[PDB]
């Protein structure tokens, strides 16, 4: 099966999908994020961050407090399973992670930690 997905964030706060499926036979998985908007990352930055559902709000809140220079992620945040850099217009970044970090039946969320963005810039990730 395919073990990658292409995700975009633009000059609005929604990703172009709200649900990612990771096939259970995949051993790694890659997310390729890009930003087809015109605004720079300090104004309309997006990252793609994966945590358990339970951990999402903490990661978002602590990430906002960490600021732009930390890509809006608390340093040494063990709650983050995988993530990309924060990108702006014209940029791109990919993350590959081990599917051994995921289990069937567990509830995962992906989201952007740029301030305010998680309200609309979030979705589920499911191993199946
Ligand atoms: Cu964002
Ligand atoms: Cu990191």
PDB file of C-alpha atoms in Angstrom, residues 30-123:
ATOM      1  CA  UNK A  30       5.766  10.056   5.266  1.00  0.00           C
ATOM      2  CA  UNK A  31       3.891  13.276   5.302  1.00  0.00           C
ATOM      3  CA  UNK A  32       4.890  15.859   2.667  1.00  0.00           C
ATOM      4  CA  UNK A  33       3.705  19.294   3.736  1.00  0.00           C
ATOM      5  CA  UNK A  34       3.651  22.294   1.476  1.00  0.00           C
ATOM      6  CA  UNK A  35       2.401  25.893   1.576  1.00  0.00           C
ATOM      7  CA  UNK A  36       0.918  27.185  -1.679  1.00  0.00           C
ATOM      8  CA  UNK A  37      -0.091  30.501  -0.087  1.00  0.00           C
ATOM      9  CA  UNK A  38       1.625  33.850  -0.279  1.00  0.00           C
ATOM     10  CA  UNK A  39       2.223  34.645   3.378  1.00  0.00           C
ATOM     11  CA  UNK A  40       5.391  34.011   5.347  1.00  0.00           C
ATOM     12  CA  UNK A  41       5.724  31.632   8.236  1.00  0.00           C
ATOM     13  CA  UNK A  42       5.674  34.316  10.966  1.00  0.00           C
ATOM     14  CA  UNK A  43       2.256  35.368   9.862  1.00  0.00           C
ATOM     15  CA  UNK A  44       0.670  32.208   8.469  1.00  0.00           C
ATOM     16  CA  UNK A  45       3.053  29.443   9.281  1.00  0.00           C
ATOM     17  CA  UNK A  46       1.877  25.826   9.290  1.00  0.00           C
ATOM     18  CA  UNK A  47       3.374  22.697  10.759  1.00  0.00           C
ATOM     19  CA  UNK A  48       1.998  19.109  10.835  1.00  0.00           C
ATOM     20  CA  UNK A  49       2.194  17.659  14.363  1.00  0.00           C
ATOM     21  CA  UNK A  50       1.016  14.186  15.421  1.00  0.00           C
ATOM     22  CA  UNK A  51       0.049  13.243  18.990  1.00  0.00           C
ATOM     23  CA  UNK A  52      -2.520  11.098  20.776  1.00  0.00           C
ATOM     24  CA  UNK A  53      -5.925  12.724  20.966  1.00  0.00           C
ATOM     25  CA  UNK A  54      -5.482  13.122  24.712  1.00  0.00           C
ATOM     26  CA  UNK A  55      -2.230  14.977  24.273  1.00  0.00           C
ATOM     27  CA  UNK A  56      -3.226  17.396  21.496  1.00  0.00           C
ATOM     28  CA  UNK A  57      -4.467  20.336  23.609  1.00  0.00           C
ATOM     29  CA  UNK A  58      -1.370  20.301  25.843  1.00  0.00           C
ATOM     30  CA  UNK A  59       0.949  20.237  22.897  1.00  0.00           C
ATOM     31  CA  UNK A  60      -0.982  23.148  21.273  1.00  0.00           C
ATOM     32  CA  UNK A  61      -1.041  25.224  24.443  1.00  0.00           C
ATOM     33  CA  UNK A  62       2.620  24.747  25.380  1.00  0.00           C
ATOM     34  CA  UNK A  63       3.577  25.205  21.769  1.00  0.00           C
ATOM     35  CA  UNK A  64       1.915  28.623  21.549  1.00  0.00           C
ATOM     36  CA  UNK A  65       3.903  29.686  24.614  1.00  0.00           C
ATOM     37  CA  UNK A  66       7.154  28.529  23.049  1.00  0.00           C
ATOM     38  CA  UNK A  67       7.057  31.005  20.228  1.00  0.00           C
ATOM     39  CA  UNK A  68       8.101  31.242  16.600  1.00  0.00           C
ATOM     40  CA  UNK A  69      11.755  30.543  17.286  1.00  0.00           C
ATOM     41  CA  UNK A  70      10.823  27.119  18.541  1.00  0.00           C
ATOM     42  CA  UNK A  71       8.393  26.512  15.680  1.00  0.00           C
ATOM     43  CA  UNK A  72       5.617  26.714  18.229  1.00  0.00           C
ATOM     44  CA  UNK A  73       6.592  23.474  19.942  1.00  0.00           C
ATOM     45  CA  UNK A  74       7.742  23.120  23.564  1.00  0.00           C
ATOM     46  CA  UNK A  75      11.285  21.779  23.535  1.00  0.00           C
ATOM     47  CA  UNK A  76      11.724  18.149  24.466  1.00  0.00           C
ATOM     48  CA  UNK A  77       7.984  17.486  24.258  1.00  0.00           C
ATOM     49  CA  UNK A  78       7.673  13.732  24.551  1.00  0.00           C
ATOM     50  CA  UNK A  79       3.985  13.970  23.607  1.00  0.00           C
ATOM     51  CA  UNK A  80       4.851  14.700  19.994  1.00  0.00           C
ATOM     52  CA  UNK A  81       5.042  11.488  17.978  1.00  0.00           C
ATOM     53  CA  UNK A  82       6.261  13.103  14.822  1.00  0.00           C
ATOM     54  CA  UNK A  83       6.193  16.472  13.203  1.00  0.00           C
ATOM     55  CA  UNK A  84       7.339  18.650  10.396  1.00  0.00           C
ATOM     56  CA  UNK A  85       9.000  22.061  10.525  1.00  0.00           C
ATOM     57  CA  UNK A  86       6.844  25.193  10.521  1.00  0.00           C
ATOM     58  CA  UNK A  87       6.735  26.414   6.923  1.00  0.00           C
ATOM     59  CA  UNK A  88       5.548  29.466   5.130  1.00  0.00           C
ATOM     60  CA  UNK A  89       4.731  30.447   1.504  1.00  0.00           C
ATOM     61  CA  UNK A  90       6.721  28.548  -1.041  1.00  0.00           C
ATOM     62  CA  UNK A  91       8.306  26.184   1.460  1.00  0.00           C
ATOM     63  CA  UNK A  92       7.952  22.508   2.017  1.00  0.00           C
ATOM     64  CA  UNK A  93       8.969  19.920   4.569  1.00  0.00           C
ATOM     65  CA  UNK A  94       8.547  16.161   4.971  1.00  0.00           C
ATOM     66  CA  UNK A  95       8.603  13.889   8.011  1.00  0.00           C
ATOM     67  CA  UNK A  96       9.017  10.121   7.973  1.00  0.00           C
ATOM     68  CA  UNK A  97       8.267   8.169  11.098  1.00  0.00           C
ATOM     69  CA  UNK A  98       8.139   4.577  12.263  1.00  0.00           C
ATOM     70  CA  UNK A  99       4.708   2.944  12.213  1.00  0.00           C
ATOM     71  CA  UNK A 100       5.825   0.977  15.265  1.00  0.00           C
ATOM     72  CA  UNK A 101       5.010   4.186  17.133  1.00  0.00           C
ATOM     73  CA  UNK A 102       1.317   3.718  16.262  1.00  0.00           C
ATOM     74  CA  UNK A 103      -1.167   1.101  17.359  1.00  0.00           C
ATOM     75  CA  UNK A 104      -4.551   0.071  15.945  1.00  0.00           C
ATOM     76  CA  UNK A 105      -7.429   1.321  18.048  1.00  0.00           C
ATOM     77  CA  UNK A 106      -5.538   4.195  19.555  1.00  0.00           C
ATOM     78  CA  UNK A 107      -6.831   7.679  18.790  1.00  0.00           C
ATOM     79  CA  UNK A 108      -4.431  10.121  17.098  1.00  0.00           C
ATOM     80  CA  UNK A 109      -4.769  13.665  15.952  1.00  0.00           C
ATOM     81  CA  UNK A 110      -2.663  15.788  13.588  1.00  0.00           C
ATOM     82  CA  UNK A 111      -2.716  19.517  13.918  1.00  0.00           C
ATOM     83  CA  UNK A 112      -0.909  22.841  13.360  1.00  0.00           C
ATOM     84  CA  UNK A 113       0.522  24.552  16.494  1.00  0.00           C
ATOM     85  CA  UNK A 114       0.753  28.070  14.969  1.00  0.00           C
ATOM     86  CA  UNK A 115      -1.265  30.227  17.327  1.00  0.00           C
ATOM     87  CA  UNK A 116      -5.006  29.723  16.883  1.00  0.00           C
ATOM     88  CA  UNK A 117      -4.710  27.367  13.944  1.00  0.00           C
ATOM     89  CA  UNK A 118      -5.724  24.143  15.677  1.00  0.00           C
ATOM     90  CA  UNK A 119      -9.346  25.162  15.853  1.00  0.00           C
ATOM     91  CA  UNK A 120      -9.643  24.424  12.116  1.00  0.00           C
ATOM     92  CA  UNK A 121      -6.255  22.983  11.232  1.00  0.00           C
ATOM     93  CA  UNK A 122      -6.588  19.497  12.683  1.00  0.00           C
ATOM     94  CA  UNK A 123      -7.697  16.002  11.665  1.00  0.00           C
TER      95      UNK A 123
END
